[model samples]
Target: AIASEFSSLPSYAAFATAQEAYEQAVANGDSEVVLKKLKKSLNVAKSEFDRDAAMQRKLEKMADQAMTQMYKQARSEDKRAKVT
Candidate 1:
C-alpha cells in the first residue's frame, strides 16, 4: 500500500535527483521548486517501485549490512558501549 503511491513515475536516478532537489529547495525556502521537485521525485519513486521489486529487496539486504557495520563502529568510538 505504501509503495502503491510511487507506481506511476520515472527512473530511479531521476527520482533520486528530484528528492535531493526537493530537500534543497525546502531548506532554501523555495516553495515552488520544492513542490515541483517533490512531485517529480514521488512519480519516479512510484515508477521504480512498480518496475523493480527485486532491486528493492537487494538494496534492503545491503542496507541492513551497512547499518550493522555502522553501529558496530560507532560502539567502538564510545568506551562505555564497547564489549569486553
Candidate 2:
C-alpha cells in the first residue's frame, strides 16, 4: 500500500526507488543493511535548477515525512512478524 501510494506521485520515483531497496533490506532482517538503506533514503531530494529554495525544501520535507512514516511502519510490521 505504501509503496503503491508513493509510486503514484509524479516525482516520487527517487524516493520510491529508495523505498524498494529498503524493503529488500527489511526482508533480509539485517540491522546493518536496514540502517544503511534508511539513511540512503533520508537523503532528501531536489533538482539542481530549482529556482525557489523554500519551495524545494518544502517539497523535500514533504517527501521525507511521507517516506519516514511509511518506512517506520514497515519496520514495525517486520518486527511484529518476527514475534509471531
Candidate 3:
C-alpha cells in the first residue's frame, strides 16, 4: 500500500504556486512575457518566504539558464526586434 502524505500549507505555498505558474508558462509556450513574469513572481516569492532561500536561488538559475537553453525559441520569435 502506498499513502501520499498531504503536508500542511505554509508560506512556501505561494513560492510553489509561482513556480507552478512559471512551469505552466513554459509548458504552454515560450515568450519574454513569461520570463518577465518569472522574475516578478520569483522575487515576490523570495521576499515572502524564508525557508527555502537556497532553493529559491536555484530556481532563478534554473529558469534563467536551463529554461533559456531548453527554449531558445523565445529569441527565435523575437529575431525581428528591429524596433522596441
Per-residue CA lDDT of model 1 for 1-84, tens digit only, reads: 354333334455566676677777777876875677586667766566566766666888998998798767733344355443
Prediction RMSDs, each to the true structure: 14.0, 20.3, 20.6
| Alpha-carbon TM-score of each model against the true structure | 0.35, 0.32, 0.39
Q: Residue 71 of candidate 1: its Cα lDDT?
A: 65
Residues 1-84, model 3: lDDT tens digits: 652121232766777788788877878787968878797888877565554555666788886986577665543454444533
Best by lDDT: 3
Per-residue error (Å), model 3, residue 70? 53
The candidate with the higher TM-score, 2 or 3, is 3
Displacement of residue 21 (Cα, Å) in model 1 is 1.4
Pick the winner on TM-score between candidates 1 and 2: 1
Backbone clashes in model 2: 0
* Candidate 2: residue pairs that collide: none
Least lDDT summed over 10 consecutive residues: which range in candidate 1? 1-10
TM-score attained by model 1: 0.35
